[PDB]
Design a protein around this ligand. Structure first.
Ligand SMILES: Nc1ncnc2c1ncn2[C@@H]1O[C@H](COP(=O)(O)OP(=O)(O)O)[C@@H](O)[C@H]1O
Ligand SMILES: Nc1ncnc2c1ncn2[C@@H]1O[C@H](COP(=O)(O)O)[C@@H](O)[C@H]1O
Ligand SMILES: *P(=O)(O)OC[C@H]1O[C@@H](n2cnc3c(N)ncnc32)[C@@H](O)[C@@H]1O
Ligand SMILES: *P(=O)(O)OC[C@H]1O[C@@H](n2cnc3c(N)ncnc32)[C@@H](O)[C@@H]1O
Ligand SMILES: *P(=O)(O)OC[C@H]1O[C@@H](n2cnc3c(N)ncnc32)[C@@H](O)[C@@H]1O
Lengths: 105, 94, 100, 96, 105, 105
């Protein structure tokens, strides 16, 4: 099992969700986040850029496809398009049923 | 060391916190999120290898309503852990 | 490739950003989060900072964040490392070190 | 027209919404807020209502948000001098 | 002096900001908010509709024009388009200078 | 009764709260909000500036004092220091007791 995490521009969220759903990939968690001076006495960084974090739990066999869908859909060519990364999931449980591993995907 | 992450219904949060505290599990970070809007909370716990499966079972059994939307719980390996205040590492940082 | 995640007090944020930037490390993500009546009342505002980093720089980045986020008082938080199995730059599709 | 604003404990939100719905009042907006390095989460509820119904709406929110302990919050009324429904361009009472 | 408040769909936000700018109106505030069941131990509304609250401080002379710009720019013709309202401002202060009234706009 | 609303830089919040407390003014609600290049994606503003909205319900007799405390504390002299404004409160109720008006302050 893999976790795919993507930090992307907020206005791409709808397009990413639709592209995954047409690939049969449903299930996604979205969190608002920020990437990147003024003195007030300390120093404060003043300008933030809004992003969304998209998290998809996925089978090993579909991990690469999900990455490519998000990359291709989130891309605008301009700078700040963001990053996608993969981490390993060692255990997975569906709360409702208690199914584990593949059965929980 | 393991990271336990759960996406659960917001109204289960206090019950999960209480269930974990009686198991001696202290630290917990809580982030508002949403999924497929439906508001959820992400709960994250850093736990020893020996207690990690117990923590998963506590969260699963306490977050369960039997209805759709109950969420998922997963485990990620932690390769290094440092407690900021002391600089202790590994098991000593837990 | 490594992900460094830290839960720290909100007022350390600029000091951490500057200290990372000083070490040539850019690109951090910041998320508001929190730690800890019948019908929990109090919450403690925290920030989660995440930094994608090469294996060669991972320990240095951990050390910068730990030293920069420390107050000596309870609640200072924790810093941890997870392994990244694939990194992609959205703009180019580049992987690995070319995506840093 | 009146704006009714209330700062209330988050777990009373659905009960207030249902009590207002039974009174025929629809269209509330809900914003996370916090009040008084340690905050207590509250929700701000805002309702736009006719002059004739405004005091009833205050009573519903007060009675449904009350727990009898500290933190129950406050409810207040602001005068609305003009109101427009975006979809139709209706104004005043027709926008309610 | 007036406060104009509007609850509108989030994708109209840039169009509204642009139309206000074209009219020489700047200084809007934007707040994420929600419009509108599961029982647990009791009742809980299950889902929400994302909205944005927009607030603009405006002279009396320009208040109707600003209302009309926001209404025409936020409109889609679909349900959920929101509402725009005006409240009276009894004192306005610019923090930097302490200037009141028209000097604070 | 009056409502004092202030849009100020987030790093001034603690100093404003302490200044209001040492003046005997208790009770405040704080909301995260944003003020305002342009990116096209098919038009989207991207650079947001974080602010906090502070709201204080106050008696008529202390309204001016509260405005001046917030203004003087939130001021840094730089641009973006924000604005403070006053609106009239026609009715006020303390939820816990049902006290009204002055008794609810
Ligand atoms: N594959 C996934 N990846 C990331 N998050 C997920 C995934 N599946 C579910 N979630 C999270 O868990 C919550 C509950 O999911 P689930 O119960 O499967 O949703 P539904 O009620 O639509 O069946 C979702 O709101 C989502 O945030
Ligand atoms: N004077 C005030 N101005 C603004 N908000 C207030 C005021 N008094 C109370 N509140 C809000 O109501 C919440 C509950 O306060 P209380 O009911 O007085 O314990 C606070 O945390 C604030 O969010
Ligand atoms: P477009 O289809 O007009 O917008 C779709 C979604 O994009 C988000 N979003 C709106 N406005 C911004 C801005 N200024 N910056 C980042 N993301 C934005 C959602 O709010 C909107 O529904
Ligand atoms: P119960 O004691 O009422 O739950 C308390 C907590 O539940 C969360 N929550 C409240 N209301 C909702 C709704 N409508 N939807 C999802 N989660 C909810 C917290 O807000 C509250 O503190
Ligand atoms: P200072 O006393 O270091 O911080 C006080 C509070 O100000 C907020 N804040 C922290 N960091 C920022 C930045 N970069 N920009 C705006 N506001 C900031 C709180 O987070 C902090 O506790």
């Amino acid at each position: 099992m893999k976790l795919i995490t993507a930090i992307v521009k907020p206005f791409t969220l709808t397009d990413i969700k639709d592209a995954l759903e047409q690939a049969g990939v449903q299930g996604m968690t979205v969190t608002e986040t920020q990437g990147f001076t003024e003195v007030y006495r300390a120093e404060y960084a003043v300008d933030f850029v809004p992003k969304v974090k998209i998290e998809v739990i996925i089978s090993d066999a579909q991990a690469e496809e999900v990455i490519n869908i998000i990359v291709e859909t989130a891309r605008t060519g301009k700078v700040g398009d963001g990053k996608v990364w993969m981490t390993n999931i060692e255990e997975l449980v569906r709360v409702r049923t208690g199914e584990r591993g593949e059965a929980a995907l």
